[PDB]
Write a protein that binds this ligand. Structure first.
Ligand SMILES: [K+]
Ligand SMILES: [K+]
Ligand SMILES: [K+]
Ligand SMILES: [K+]
Ligand SMILES: [K+]
Ligand SMILES: [K+]
Ligand SMILES: [K+]
Ligand SMILES: [K+]
Ligand SMILES: [K+]
Ligand SMILES: [K+]
Ligand SMILES: [K+]
Ligand SMILES: [K+]
Ligand SMILES: [K+]
Ligand SMILES: [K+]
Ligand SMILES: [K+]
Ligand SMILES: [Mg+2]
Ligand SMILES: [Mg+2]
Ligand SMILES: [Mg+2]
Ligand SMILES: [Mg+2]
Ligand SMILES: [Mg+2]
Ligand SMILES: [Mg+2]
Ligand SMILES: [Mg+2]
Ligand SMILES: [Mg+2]
Ligand SMILES: [Mg+2]
Ligand SMILES: [Mg+2]
Ligand SMILES: [Mg+2]
Ligand SMILES: [Mg+2]
Ligand SMILES: [Mg+2]
Ligand SMILES: [Mg+2]
Ligand SMILES: [Mg+2]
Ligand SMILES: [Mg+2]
Ligand SMILES: [Mg+2]
Ligand SMILES: [Mg+2]
Ligand SMILES: [Mg+2]
Ligand SMILES: [Mg+2]
Ligand SMILES: [Mg+2]
Ligand SMILES: [Mg+2]
Ligand SMILES: [Mg+2]
Ligand SMILES: [Mg+2]
Ligand SMILES: [Mg+2]
Ligand SMILES: [Mg+2]
Ligand SMILES: [Mg+2]
Ligand SMILES: [Mg+2]
Ligand SMILES: [Mg+2]
Ligand SMILES: [Mg+2]
Ligand SMILES: [Mg+2]
Ligand SMILES: [Mg+2]
Ligand SMILES: [Mg+2]
Ligand SMILES: [Mg+2]
Ligand SMILES: [Mg+2]
Ligand SMILES: [Mg+2]
Ligand SMILES: [Mg+2]
Ligand SMILES: [Mg+2]
Ligand SMILES: [Mg+2]
Ligand SMILES: [Mg+2]
Ligand SMILES: [Mg+2]
Ligand SMILES: [Mg+2]
Ligand SMILES: [Mg+2]
Ligand SMILES: [Mg+2]
Lengths: 64, 144, 117, 201
RNA sequence: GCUUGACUGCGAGCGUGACGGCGCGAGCAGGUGCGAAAGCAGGUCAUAGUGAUCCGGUGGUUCUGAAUGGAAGGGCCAUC
RNA sequence: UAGCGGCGAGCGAACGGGGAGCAGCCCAGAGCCUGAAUCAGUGUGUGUGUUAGUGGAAGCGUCUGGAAAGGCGCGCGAUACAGGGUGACAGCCCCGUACACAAAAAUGCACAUGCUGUGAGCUCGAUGAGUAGGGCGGGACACGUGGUAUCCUGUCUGAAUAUGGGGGGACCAUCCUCCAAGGCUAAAUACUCCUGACUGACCGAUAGUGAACCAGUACCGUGAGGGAAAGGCGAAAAGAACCCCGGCGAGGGGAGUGAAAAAGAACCUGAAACCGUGUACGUACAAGCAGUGGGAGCACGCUUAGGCGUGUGACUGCGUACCUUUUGUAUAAUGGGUCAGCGACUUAUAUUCUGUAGCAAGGUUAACCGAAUAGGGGAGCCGAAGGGAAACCGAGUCUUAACU
């Protein structure tokens, strides 16, 4: 049968033009008052999945 | 050319691995699985994304965004597609008739990709700044 | 495509049992035991192609020593003497001469002694 | 590209694309193998340990008997047990890309021409459905093992050919890659050559 | 003494991590404080004072809005 | 995919598109004209099938052999060279096969034509209430109560009824669309205890059914239930008259049959473990994985008369099996009494990468149609554009009031 997407992964990663994946940074959901504006500002843009983790993401998203 | 003088191309037919057929094969005994543990077992191995119990990457990162229903009914047309319609009048129905866009597409944009050389009239479609200049340079026109 | 193994299995077992001819008891009769015996015979044969070269040189040396000492010189001085005389005759041949041509061996000893003189 | 006739004395003209291309052995091989795979029926099965007739009772207790542990009388280790990877009916057919099929046929036909195995004729007919007549016609033409391709498949020639095992008679629509290779000679009517010309072009 | 730079948007480059992350940062834009001025200031001599994701709450933002206009709900930003 | 989801594991649509197949009607009611229609039922024609059957071509000589269908030579049939049998492999010996025919009787079907009931059509009405909806509890919907539409209803309630009502995914307005609470309806779809025919890169007696055989038997169990083993003389029984030893035995030796009896029924082939008889050599002062390297002697062959070969192996150097598991095993750790047979990385569908082939800014079709491995079918799918959560913009885009 067709492989099933890991649906939680599909909600967290989007494939980019050269076949990497963008994700949102962790640590910007709550407990924000104590965090420096600089730290939070750098967490706001999307980031690319690292080399070590790409295998895990690709396994989860066969139809990306 | 006989049924007993045909050969496959060199490199086209690699023999499959056969595990567990003795020492000389190089895949005897353990069959490439190493010694013991979950991965050596029949049916053995952990599920996709499992990292040993550490919160996995697809759960320690946050969800983001929503899915647009409008994006699914919006297409992009290349300049190369404009010559492929019948009659040199590009609109949503003529693009559908030429199999350029799907039946359920409601909105389409012409972008600067490929080349237009024939003169064409684009009707009821959005056109990029660059596509507009290319269509008009090729003698065409864009009707809003 | 069911494949029966009997013809090939028989030929393989018979090949091993033929190489185990002369071995004692189960070693010439029983495949499981004969197989181990044939492997070990092969391991020893490999080792002993090296050992054969050691054992023969040891034998030649012992005989040269006996013959040299009958002519009033030790092996170690005899060999040194031959090397100083530029005689390149090897130990297989010297030991052969020591047994089969004692006058020629004596001539080699006198050559060795002259080079040491 | 010219092909000459036999019963009429002419030089018919055909395409270099169809009847003059180089022999692509790898392509032809793939299509011939696919054709043989498509002939397979794939009808068989064995019984897994689930399907062998017998009870699910554990043959003897897990511990204490001094025997190897047993779970099922149907174990594939056991005489009368299941087949470990019991066969099921299979579909052995392969996909052949349409262009690869047509490319293979062009290679085959071009090679038949190069090897002087394609014989073009104006007409090939028999007066009656009599095997003796066709046998006489073929020995006249110095043919024994031959594929005969006609425009319209007539009853008389089809019936005359049936009991000659070395002879087969097709219409141009019924050509297949294996039969073009398998027969020693291929006889084509001028009509059939046109139809194969149009089919491949 | 005077003050709100414990600023907002960004950030060359670098450190440290398997990763998630964490850290240092001149400089650029806007607006600000102190100083006559050069200047200094994006918290505190530095290194501890912390908790991913989910689910939900509050404010902002017509980004989305299942016939259409709205709305609900969702997104995005801030925050709990 | 959209969604659902301790937003975990997992679950998973629809809209819309391409196909197969297509078929629409009746009551909730009178009247008018009439019973015409179409379905059934029950009769008889009419073909056409089924359940027995009939005919069905063409070969001889010679060689080998127990036997010819084989070899060799020369003929003949073929709308028949499917297949099976016959003393080895047969188009022409036999049974068939292609093809052409056949039914007293029963019966299926398709027509046509009698007959019983069913009653067409047309104006004029009518239009399913403890129901829809609601509250509570559950269930069903991909949808876990969620912002949750829609469906079902155990419980308590309860409309409007065409100027009316349902739905369009909370809800409202507008617009669109449909008409619940009565019912019938072929085809395309599912399956095979069973019957016929045909097929297989399916098995070939530990396989294939549990069962090739008097097997769901023997046997086991109070019972439900469990559940085997076990095929082959030969072409033909010509299955061994008769004689001899023996207990009027068993068993054997002759004779005879046969191509063969070491095919003799304990029967094709007849492996291995295992057990014997015979011969050569070794072995009764000698210590251990039993071999290996060296090696005398003896016996028997042999083509220089030479050594050479084969068997044996006194004496001597070296030398603690195999598997597994381990840091590490002669290990006194595991496993194996031996042999023979069987016994473990497969299959399907998705997906990615490599190789290879085709075509190439294109590539490829699925179901299905087609007698078609052809051909048709481009519905789709992947690719030629990305950025952004998204609207949206687009070789850019996002970020930000704006970017060095
Ligand atoms: K491996
Ligand atoms: K034929
Ligand atoms: K500043
Ligand atoms: K003959
Ligand atoms: K026959
Ligand atoms: K109710
Ligand atoms: K309405
Ligand atoms: K059974
Ligand atoms: K059985
Ligand atoms: K020894
Ligand atoms: K251990
Ligand atoms: K133990
Ligand atoms: K693959
Ligand atoms: K490929
Ligand atoms: K940029
Ligand atoms: Mg937030
Ligand atoms: Mg290895
Ligand atoms: Mg192991
Ligand atoms: Mg381990
Ligand atoms: Mg491992
Ligand atoms: Mg298991
Ligand atoms: Mg834990
Ligand atoms: Mg299309
Ligand atoms: Mg077989
Ligand atoms: Mg033996
Ligand atoms: Mg079985
Ligand atoms: Mg096709
Ligand atoms: Mg301080
Ligand atoms: Mg401090
Ligand atoms: Mg939750
Ligand atoms: Mg709306
Ligand atoms: Mg709506
Ligand atoms: Mg006949
Ligand atoms: Mg025979
Ligand atoms: Mg109604
Ligand atoms: Mg309702
Ligand atoms: Mg209700
Ligand atoms: Mg409700
Ligand atoms: Mg309810
Ligand atoms: Mg419920
Ligand atoms: Mg509603
Ligand atoms: Mg059986
Ligand atoms: Mg057998
Ligand atoms: Mg008797
Ligand atoms: Mg015999
Ligand atoms: Mg026989
Ligand atoms: Mg026998
Ligand atoms: Mg002694
Ligand atoms: Mg003593
Ligand atoms: Mg002893
Ligand atoms: Mg020792
Ligand atoms: Mg240990
Ligand atoms: Mg050791
Ligand atoms: Mg020990
Ligand atoms: Mg011991
Ligand atoms: Mg042990
Ligand atoms: Mg153990
Ligand atoms: Mg043991
Ligand atoms: Mg895009």
């Amino acid at each position: 049968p067709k492989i099933k997407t890991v649906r939680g992964a599909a909600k967290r990663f989007k494939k980019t033009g050269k076949g990497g994946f963008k994700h949102k940074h962790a640590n910007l959901r709550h407990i924000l008052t104590k965090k420096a504006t600089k730290r939070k500002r750098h967490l706001r843009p999307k980031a690319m999945v690292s080399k070590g983790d790409l295998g895990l993401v690709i396994a989860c998203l066969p139809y990306a | 050319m006989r049924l007993n003088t045909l050969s496959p191309a060199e490199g086209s037919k690699k023999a499959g691995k056969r595990l567990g057929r003795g020492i000389g094969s190089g895949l005897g005994k353990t069959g490439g699985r190493g010694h013991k543990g979950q991965k050596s077992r029949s049916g053995g191995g952990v599920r996709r994304g499992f990292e040993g119990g550490q919160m996995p990457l697809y759960r320690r990162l946050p969800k983001f965004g929503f899915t647009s229903r409008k994006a699914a009914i919006t297409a992009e047309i290349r300049l190369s597609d404009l010559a492929k319609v019948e009659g040199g009048v590009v609109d949503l129905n003529t693009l559908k008739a030429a199999n350029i866009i799907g039946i359920q597409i409601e909105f389409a944009k012409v972008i600067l990709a490929g080349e237009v050389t024939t003169p064409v009239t684009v009707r009821g479609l959005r056109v990029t700044k660059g596509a507009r200049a290319a269509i008009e340079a090729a003698g065409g026109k864009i009707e809003e | 495509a069911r494949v029966k193994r009997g013809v090939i299995a028989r030929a393989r077992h018979k090949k091993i049992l033929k190489q185990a001819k002369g071995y004692y008891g189960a070693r010439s009769r029983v495949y499981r035991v004969a197989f181990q015996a044939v492997i070990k015979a092969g391991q020893y044969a490999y080792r002993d192609r090296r050992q054969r070269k050691r054992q023969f040189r040891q034998l030649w040396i012992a005989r040269i020593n006996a013959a040299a000492r009958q002519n009033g010189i030790s092996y170690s001085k005899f060999i040194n003497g031959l090397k100083k005389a530029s005689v390149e005759i090897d130990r297989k041949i010297l030991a052969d001469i020591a047994v089969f041509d004692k006058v020629a061996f004596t001539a080699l000893v006198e050559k060795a002694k002259a080079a040491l003189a | 590209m010219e092909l000459v006739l036999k019963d009429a004395q002419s030089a018919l003209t055909v395409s270099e694309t169809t009847f003059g291309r180089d022999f692509n052995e790898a392509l032809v091989h793939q299509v011939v193998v696919a054709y043989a795979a498509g002939a397979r029926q794939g009808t068989r099965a064995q019984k897994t340990r689930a399907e062998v007739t017998g009870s699910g009772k554990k043959p003897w207790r897990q511990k204490g008997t001094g025997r190897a542990r047993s779970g099922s009388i149907k174990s594939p280790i056991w005489r009368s047990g299941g087949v470990t990877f019991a066969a099921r009916p299979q579909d052995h057919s392969q996909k052949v890309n349409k262009k690869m099929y047509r490319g293979a046929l062009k290679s085959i036909l071009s090679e038949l021409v190069r090897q002087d195995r394609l014989i073009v004729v104006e007409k090939f007919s028999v007066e009656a459905p009599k095997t003796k007549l066709l046998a006489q016609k073929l020995k006249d033409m110095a043919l024994e093992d031959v594929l005969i391709i006609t425009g319209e498949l007539d009853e008389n020639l089809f019936l005359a050919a049936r009991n000659l095992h070395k002879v087969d008679v097709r219409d141009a629509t019924g050509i297949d890659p294996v039969s073009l290779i398998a027969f020693d000679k291929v006889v084509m009517t001028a009509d059939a050559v046109k139809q194969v010309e149009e089919m491949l072009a």
